[PDB]
UniProtKB/Swiss-Prot annotation, chains A, D:
InterPro entries: Flavodoxin/NO_synth (IPR008254), Flavodoxin_CS (IPR001226), Flavoprotein-like_sf (IPR029039). GO terms for cellular component: membrane. It comes from the Bacteria. It comes from Aquifex aeolicus (strain VF5). Belongs to the flavodoxin family. This is Flavodoxin. PROSITE patterns: FLAVODOXIN, FLAVODOXIN_LIKE. Its cofactor is FMN. The keyword Flavoprotein applies. Keywords: Electron transport, Flavoprotein, FMN, Transport.
Swiss-Prot record, chain B:
GO terms for cellular component: membrane. InterPro entries: Flavodoxin/NO_synth, Flavodoxin_CS, Flavoprotein-like_sf. This is Flavodoxin. GO terms for molecular function: electron transfer activity; FMN binding; NAD(P)H dehydrogenase (quinone) activity. Belongs to the flavodoxin family. Keywords: Electron transport, Flavoprotein, FMN, Transport.
Length: 187, 186, 186, 187
């Protein structure tokens, strides 16, 4: 009788790397039973997708340390009319850069700041998905997600997104403690 | 059975951020059934954070950033809870010496720190004066004296209480009421 | 006596343009400084190559540089990446409200500029009693007050000075600025 | 008239990781002819060191996404009295974190923020030091710098600082163009 959790994975990309991340995020979210997922490229996406979403993952290549101009334009110009009337959606960020130390966490930060501006509740993930591999401000990779931990970081983002949607909008209050006390979250 | 647990925790150099923190707490208390705990960092405990559904965290802007004492609180007393208190709701506020002085950047640093714990973090869209808002947290230069500054501080607490009510306490009817409320924009 | 300063800006409503004009004036106020003032639509990669120092201005759009400004950097100046390191740059921004993200927008401009290997800065000066520009000049709406207009001037003025000291080698200025009491109002 | 480069490398560390970075940052800085370099833990650094320096490299463990509380305490409480009168120093940041995607670029950003507040001219490095390895907001590593690229990112940070000190303070402007066109900068 409750609805499924509604998750939007929306991404820009230059080479496809962020698309490969986006697919893994989306798979991450679908893995939580009773979560529904829409996966869109920015040129495909509509203001109605966002209205539909309980939770959003927004991905961009790291372009000069920041969200891409096409993702920025979508928020500024397409979502601009919705601004002020869509507060309290849940959102996170992800990004692929040319290199480690190349600004993928900073690009994530700029996605998050854009999302916060719309009054969304934003988050990153504490989970260690590899011994030295995490996603505190969003899922980040240099190039394509190739390694097991890189693929898993992407999945974990969508997973946690779907879980926060499930806890806070669907009201599965019981999942909070399950997650907090789960030893698998730390490799 | 309307219910909610809010911690306003703050640090201060000259007391300006205490003044804000009192207004934040009173904004949170304005939502019926919301218990608020107001603490200086020196008296705050691990347990206050465990008790809270939602946190408002204040600091003076000290070189663009959270104060070292507030940083130390998070690094060293909350450090033991790191990894198991994910999902608390949190927001930020700051008093700086001046406009253009880094209060929004200090708010970013607070939010960075809270996100590190797995908290869901927000600012406020609401315009509280015609040219006065709080997108990344409540910010003032010096003491909150104008009615705008005071109301921005109150509003942060409100929205915090509201988000706890909607998302923790399960009060879904408030969401659309907030979204469509004309009074949110002066 | 020598300096090349480029002030480049985006504007939707005219507000940031008003700021840019004052930034430029501030830069010109320093003797021997040549200044170009360009909208992003008329700016070229040869402008950025000509410049010793840059002041880059955008409206605060969702707390960040506008998408038009971002396109310009990604698409036109992109080809210059890796070969223009060491240019000197700073930021400015007009937003809809105080607490609306103007320092964060500046941060995002500086982030972009640092990616080009630029040396990047803000200004310590108190141009008014509770008015400064630590991360760039910031205003809510149009710069109308005397503090606001001077905040913009001072950014332009400090860029010109950094270029005069660091490119043109006028080391004597450095200490003059460091000890100048006029820098802090009151 | 024979003035030269004064570079201070100031660091905090809790397990030694950032100290190992700091040592390599200092090695890198010393590689440029006529660069004098001080290397100092925060616990032993003074305000005289900061006054002495043309250039600074500031390093900290990534702690909750930010500079050390000890490093912060040193700027607020011992360097604060210099605020407003040391504008125009040249400075950069470096950090070691527990994991990739763990906030090291953000920690660096927080250091740069602090340094900018002092009126310093602040930078990162475009140079690629491995195929997918760079240092755009400062040198970053998860753990101890152990691989060749991780060690060379640390060195390169110190190198570029010394280079900026040489070009911008000590007048040696022939170097700008040599650095600007150097193919070695991109592995």
């Amino acid at each position: 009788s409750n609805a499924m959790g509604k998750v939007l994975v929306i991404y820009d990309t230059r080479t496809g790397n962020t698309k490969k991340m986006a697919e893994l995020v989306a798979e991450g979210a679908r893995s939580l039973e009773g979560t529904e997922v829409r996966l869109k490229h920015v040129d495909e996406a509509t203001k109605e997708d966002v209205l539909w979403a309980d939770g959003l993952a927004v991905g961009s290549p790291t372009n000069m340390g920041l969200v891409s101009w096409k993702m920025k334009r979508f928020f500024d110009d397409v979502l601009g009319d919705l601004w002020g009337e869509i507060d309290g959606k849940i959102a996170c960020a992800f990004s692929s850069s040319g290199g480690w130390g190349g600004g993928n966490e900073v690009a994530c930060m700029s996605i998050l700041t854009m999302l916060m501006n719309f009054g969304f509740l934003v988050f990153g993930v504490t989970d260690y998905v590899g011994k030295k591999f995490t996603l505190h401000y969003g899922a980040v990779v240099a190039g394509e997600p190739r390694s097991e931990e890189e693929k898993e970081a992407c999945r974990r983002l969508g997973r946690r997104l779907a879980e926060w949607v499930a806890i806070f909008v669907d009201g599965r209050k019981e999942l909070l403690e399950k997650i907090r006390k789960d030893p698998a979250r730390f490799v």
